Design a protein around this nucleic acid. Structure first.
Ligand SMILES: [Zn+2]
Ligand SMILES: [Zn+2]
Ligand SMILES: [Zn+2]
Ligand SMILES: [Zn+2]
Length: 1271
RNA sequence: GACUUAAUGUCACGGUACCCAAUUUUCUGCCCCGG
């Protein structure tokens, strides 16, 4: 008649449910599913606090199962006393049914006890069950119980007032995933409780018989699992912060709304979250980025005024008032509040069905054979992340335990209470179920409402496997990864399509415990373990987690050890050592001499090459394709959040990662550069969908097209999985990142647009030192020949260079030069992977042709005036497919310098090292990446775009409107002086001009791409004798262009575009270098290196989906004939920078045809293309008087082409005697270098006495007209 | 103690928060007349 005080300790997070009695339980679903959990009852009016307990019937059922298993292991005999096989049935007519009904099978044995159990003398099993006693099924009192299990209360160490549910539990949503489609069918909710603080329960067991006492104390140690967690049973003797931060976030959102800058709030939200990865000093020591050289606007977003103050000072005064909650929680709370306010402003469940019907109430005895041996195996090891991982969870403030009742774009990761990463038990068990079903070949879909247990092989083996949840030793914050969408018609982004996820680092380690109780170790479980384990040669293939299409959640199994318990002979040592539950960490570090007795190492573990479920069902499941991209251009994959946080006022930086190391225990100090898996997943998807023509469909629900079979949709998972492209040779570079700055040039003034300068920081890729990125993807088994051909054609299209990586690909960034494929790829993928002259001589102007003694003086820039008519096409050519009637290919071109050329590297303003003395003197070098002279692609693109726009009467694409003239003030601004048709194109509703249709706009991608030019041949470095380097001429003064000379009254609107003349005026700069370096201030001059005439550069132009006349006009704009050339670079009024482009080759491909080939496009078809372009220009003019035939075209029959080609005429080309004199005037008769009695000042060309304003505009409009003796 | 179980019968270690979506489109580091 003695009592036993028992203590129950958990080692995993257990499950919690609400308490109802018996009938309110049947009214509910979550309570009926939630039996055999830990119950929770409320306390007091209002549902905030209560207490948790575990009922005595649950502990009774666990002990009864343990007694039955222990008596089955010893054939119905414990410590030499025999016992019968109990009773587990109740007749319905005599008494009621016992409130819980068994569906599982009960173990039996042969009764060899030689008696029959009655009230007087009973076996130990019948005493422990409670058959022959009083108080059955209707409770009266605690006495007349032979064995009594009391309730188990939470042994709260700090039980002072109450326990809140949000302090013990945390809600979570589980899932059910179909095997074939990979999509969810239904979901349900649970409550998981903490075990480190609230995991000890205490209770009392009362007994009135000692024959039961020996077996009961033996069987309390064999209970291994209760309420969803591994257990051990022993016998002993800040809402105010959220409210204040919510009101402050409302103030921030309204202040952004008043400036009409609401869309930035989303950006700002994640920026604050990224601030958890740096210290608090980035707010305390004002290390946030500032803007460029403009005091007015300040920064792009950190200087938006909120209640009269900037955002950085508001952040400082908010952090100064919430110092107690820590830095990380402060940043997360502010970011989550801003995201929820933005989402508010912008704007199924299945539990196991009831069985109250006929059904079945059966009894299934199973008696195992006598000579069997039952053993228990334990596998211990570590799990190491090979990729980033993601374990999804619901949003906080949507999963709060007490209250449960527009899709989100932000997603979070699963963490513990101490902010540690967590592989839950359910995810590991689901992945083990999936791989075991693949290993067996056949299994069932899981049925929930069941009266008979499933008899498939997977469900047989999964009822003997016990796992354990894992947590790491890492607490550092996650990273945020971003994804967008792309409109396939315009090749731009779609608004409202941005979303982000939270990922953890690669290299992290987690513990791993598995237990299996049975008669023999299965072949299929060992095959799955060997499929998960990594060795030399083989990599791991454990796909846990939930973003596997992007390659997130590939783990490996390191350091496996398998131990074995013999339960038929050493059951007492198992009972004593409690199965090493909770001490599995010590098994990995124990030697073989310190093991407990009864646990031996298991040496008959099957090797990889002898397992038969391996090599037939698991290894051919996924096939690997590894490759190496060789990129010979600057590569820029933008970050857009790191640029807002790291100090150094950069605009676009490259993408980085964080990799955890395991030799030491911290993250690696230097980060790794990579191209994300999402980016080249989208590259492959667009590359397949353009050739098959499936991107044009507007809907993809209930589809079965090719890109929905390979890449999946909303109803099936993908058969192709991508990984990142990491840089492998970024250590043989010096200064891997390179600073490149660009600007926009106004078309009327010829100078830079005010505040349009931007800068990029791409990685230094050169054609003689290229970047090498290593990548890999996985293909599922079951692919046909056509789908393999589609993927291989996409790989060959990446290799040929149609899809550049990253941003700014139209100006030459991220051009793939090659692809190499290693020897481990299967043989099908390896075997499927493996003069022009224009001859058009323009008759030049007769005024610098009839003089021929060089006495005239001309003006160095003139203006072109095509009047008002622009043609805006409303049917835009789309990027969705490769159309059959259109053209696509590449042009290889060469560039030759007729005059010296200056292309500066404007990063360093002291690169020739001359500012030690003469401080404030800008001096530059030539443009180079890694010591190789290059010309950027943006310069060539802007030159050709200005020529194409002036040829075809296009709009002014880059134009300054806010500036106002003043001579006396003025009337409306110089944006209002322009005609309405010449304004820049905005939107696709009103159409597009020819220049904006070919080269692009903000809402439509261009169809031409210009590459970087490389130097290859000829001399270099025009040498001057007396100079501090032998290179590096010192230039003159290059002052800002003044538009008041061309509009000299309130009338007389804008005189068109501005072009410069070709002359050898650099000779007089080269001669008087001593006159230049003395007597002009060094803050006004620029010193820079020059290249001589005769150097050859080479570059490529790439185009897709062009009509015939567009390619004709492009080939005409590249090489417009003899005696016509272009202007490029610095110092164009002084004569520097005349280039001539020769077309070396033209290739055109047609990939909608039978075979994808590359032609050579002979001379006859090129002449036909230029002729078609000329006929299109005549049709746009309207003059039908010019006949149609096979005559070589005379472009000077159109007036504006004649003016344009007079402006670009090179007179000194064919070794003729003439070279004109081109120079600006010199203010007054005393200024600098006046020439006696020439009268070439601005004092005489300025007033309305020597020439009125009309003839001045007349002289600035007509090309090459002499200005000395004025005519 | 009660709050808070019923007792000859609890496979909820009977269920992967899973699935689809390229941070990108456009822009020549350029340039002479007065205060
Ligand atoms: Zn008995
Ligand atoms: Zn099954
Ligand atoms: Zn489809
Ligand atoms: Zn336009």
């Amino acid at each position: 008649d003695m009592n036993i005080t028992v203590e129950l300790t958990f080692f995993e997070p257990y499950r919690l449910v609400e308490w109802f009695d018996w009938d309110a339980r049947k009214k509910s679903h979550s309570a009926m599913r939630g039996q055999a959990f830990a119950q929770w009852t409320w306390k007091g009016k209002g549902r905030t606090a209560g207490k948790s307990f575990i009922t005595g019937t649950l502990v009774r059922s666990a002990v009864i199962k343990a007694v039955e298993e222990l008596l089955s292991l010893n054939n119905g005999k414990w410590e030499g006393v025999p016992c019968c096989n109990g009773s587990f049935q109740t007749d319905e007519s005599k008494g009621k049914k016992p409130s819980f009904l068994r569906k599982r099978h009960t173990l039996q044995w042969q009764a060899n006890n030689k008696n029959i159990c009655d009230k007087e003398e009973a076996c130990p099993f019948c005493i422990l069950l409670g058959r022959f006693d009083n108080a059955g099924k209707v409770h009266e009192r605690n006495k007349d119980y032979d064995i009594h299990f009391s309730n188990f209360d939470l042994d709260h160490k700090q039980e002072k007032n109450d326990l809140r549910l949000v302090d013990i539990a945390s809600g979570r949503i589980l899932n059910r995933v179909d095997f074939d489609t990979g999509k969810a069918k239904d979901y349900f909710r649970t409550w998981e409780a903490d075990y480190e603080t609230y995991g000890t329960y205490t209770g009392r067991i009362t007994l009135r018989n000692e024959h039961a006492k020996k077996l009961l104390l033996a069987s309390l140690g064999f209970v291994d699992k209760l309420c969803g967690a591994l257990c051990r049973i022993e016998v002993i003797k800040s809402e105010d912060h959220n409210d204040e931060l919510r009101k402050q976030a409302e103030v921030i959102v309204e202040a952004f709304k008043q400036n009409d800058k609401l869309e930035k709030i989303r950006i700002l939200a994640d920026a604050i979250r990224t601030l958890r990865l740096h210290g608090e000093g980035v707010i305390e020591k004002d290390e946030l980025p500032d803007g460029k050289e403009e005091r007015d606007k300040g920064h792009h977003l950190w200087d938006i005024k909120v209640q009269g103050t900037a955002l950085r000072t508001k952040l400082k005064e908010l952090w100064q008032s919430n110092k107690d909650i820590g830095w990380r929680k402060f940043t997360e709370m502010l970011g989550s509040n801003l995201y929820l306010i933005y989402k508010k402003e912008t704007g199924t469940e299945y539990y196991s069905k009831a069985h109250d019907s006929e059904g079945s109430d059966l009894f299934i005895p199973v008696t195992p054979p006598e000579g069997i041996e039952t053993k228990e195996w334990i596998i211990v090891g570590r799990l190491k992340a090979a990729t980033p991982f993601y374990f999804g969870v619901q949003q906080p403030s949507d999963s709060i335990p007490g209250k449960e009742k527009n899709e989100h774009t932000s997603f979070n990761i699963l963490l513990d209470k101490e902010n540690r990463y967590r592989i839950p038990r359910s995810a590991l068990r689901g992945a083990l179920r999936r791989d075991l079903r693949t290993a067996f070949g056949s299994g069932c879909n899981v049925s929930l409402g069941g009266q008979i247990l499933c008899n498939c092989k997977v469900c047989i083996e999964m009822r003997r496997i016990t796992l354990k949840d894992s947590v790491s030793d890492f607490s550092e914050p996650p990273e945020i990864r971003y994804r967008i969408a792309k409109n396939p018609g315009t090749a731009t982004v779609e608004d409202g399509s941005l979303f982000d996820i939270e990922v953890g680092p690669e290299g992290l380690t987690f513990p791993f415990v598995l237990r299996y109780r049975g008669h023999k170790f299965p072949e299929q479980l060992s095959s799955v373990i060997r499929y998960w384990e990594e060795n030399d040669g083989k990599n791991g293939m454990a796909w846990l987690g939930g973003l596997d299409s992007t390659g997130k959640g590939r783990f490996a199994l390191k350091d496996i050890k398998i131990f074995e318990w013999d339960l038929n002979q050493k059951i007492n040592e198992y009972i004593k050592e409690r199965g090493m539950r909770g001490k599995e960490k010590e098994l990995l570090e124990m030697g073989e001499s310190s093991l407990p007795d009864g646990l031996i190492p298991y040496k008959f573990f099957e090797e990889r090459e002898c397992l038969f479920p391996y090599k037939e069902n698991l290894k051919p499941q996924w096939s690997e394709v590894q490759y190496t991209i060789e990129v010979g251009s600057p590569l820029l994959t933008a970050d857009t959040i790191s640029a807002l946080t790291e100090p150094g006022n950069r605009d676009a930086i490259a993408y980085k990662k964080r990799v955890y190391n395991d030799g030491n225990n911290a993250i690696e100090p230097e980060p790794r550069f990579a191209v994300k898996s999402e980016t080249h997943r989208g590259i492959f998807r667009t590359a397949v969908g353009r050739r098959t023509g499936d991107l044009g469909k507007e809907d993809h629900e209930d589809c079965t097209c090719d890109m929905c079979i390979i890449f999946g949709n909303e109803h099936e998972s993908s058969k192709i999985r991508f990984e990142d492209l990491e840089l492998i040779n970024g250590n043989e570079f010096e200064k891997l990142e390179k600073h490149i700055d660009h600007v926009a040039i106004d078309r009327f003034t010829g100078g830079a647009l005010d505040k349009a300068k931007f800068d990029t920081y791409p990685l230094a890729g050169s054609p003689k030192k290229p970047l090498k990125l290593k990548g890999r993807f996985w293909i599922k088994k079951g692919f046909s020949g056509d789908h393999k051909l589609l993927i291989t054609t996409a790989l060959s299209d990446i290799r040929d260079g149609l899809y550049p990586l990253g941003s700014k690909g139209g100006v030459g960034y991220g051009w793939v030069a090659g692809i190499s494929i290693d020897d481990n790829v299967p043989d099908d993928f390896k075997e499927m992977i493996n003069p022009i002259n224009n001859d058009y001589v323009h008759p030049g102007h007769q005024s610098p042709k009839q003089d021929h003694k060089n006495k005239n003086i001309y003006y160095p820039h003139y203006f072109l005036d095509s009047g008002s008519k622009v043609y805006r096409e409303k049917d835009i050519i789309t990027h969705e497919e490769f159309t059959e009637e259109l053209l696509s290919g590449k042009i290889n071109c060469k560039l030759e310098t007729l005059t010296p050329l200056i292309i500066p590297d404007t990063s360093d303003e002291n690169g020739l090292k001359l500012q030690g003395n003469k401080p404030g003197h800008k001096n530059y070098k030539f443009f180079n990446i890694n010591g190789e002279l290059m010309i950027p692609g943006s310069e060539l693109r802007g030159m050709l775009r200005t020529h194409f726009e002036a040829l075809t009467k296009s709009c002014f694409a880059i134009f300054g409107e806010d500036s106002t003239l003043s001579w006396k003030c003025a009337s409306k601004t110089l944006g209002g002086k322009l005609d309405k048709a010449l304004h820049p194109c905005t939107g696709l509703s009103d159409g597009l001009c020819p220049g904006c249709h070919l080269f692009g706009t903000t809402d439509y991608k261009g169809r031409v791409k210009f590459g970087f030019a490389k130097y290859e041949n000829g001399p270099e470095w025009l040498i001057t004798r007396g100079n501090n380097p032998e290179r590096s001429l010192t230039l003159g003064v290059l002052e800002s262009p003044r538009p008041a000379f061309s509009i000299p009254d309130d009338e007389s609107e804008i005189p068109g575009r501005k072009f410069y003349l070709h002359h050898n005026g650099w000779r007089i700069i080269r001669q008087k270098q001593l006159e230049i370096r003395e007597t002009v201030q060094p803050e006004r001059n620029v010193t820079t290196e020059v290249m001589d005439k005769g150097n050859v550069f080479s570059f490529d132009v790439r185009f897709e989906n062009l009509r015939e006349w567009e390619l004709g006009l492009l080939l005409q704009s590249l090489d417009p004939g003899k005696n016509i050339a272009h202007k490029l670079g610095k110092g164009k009024p002084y004569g520097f920078g005349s280039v001539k482009i020769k077309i070396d080759s033209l290739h055109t491909f047609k990939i909608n045809s039978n075979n994808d080939k590359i032609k050579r496009v002979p001379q006859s078809d090129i002449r036909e293309y230029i002729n078609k372009g000329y006929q299109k220009l005549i049709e746009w003019s309207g003059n039908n008087s010019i006949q149609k035939g096979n005559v070589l075209p005379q472009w000077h029959v159109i007036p504006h082409i004649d003016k344009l080609y007079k402006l670009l005429w090179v007179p000194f080309l064919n070794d003729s005697k003439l070279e004109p004199d081109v120079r600006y005037p010199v203010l007054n008769e005393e200024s600098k270098g006046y020439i006696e009695g020439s009268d070439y000042t601005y004092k005489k060309l300025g007033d309305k006495d020597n020439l009125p304003y009309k003839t001045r505009v007349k002289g600035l409009t007509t090309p090459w007209s002499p200005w000395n003796p004025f005519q």
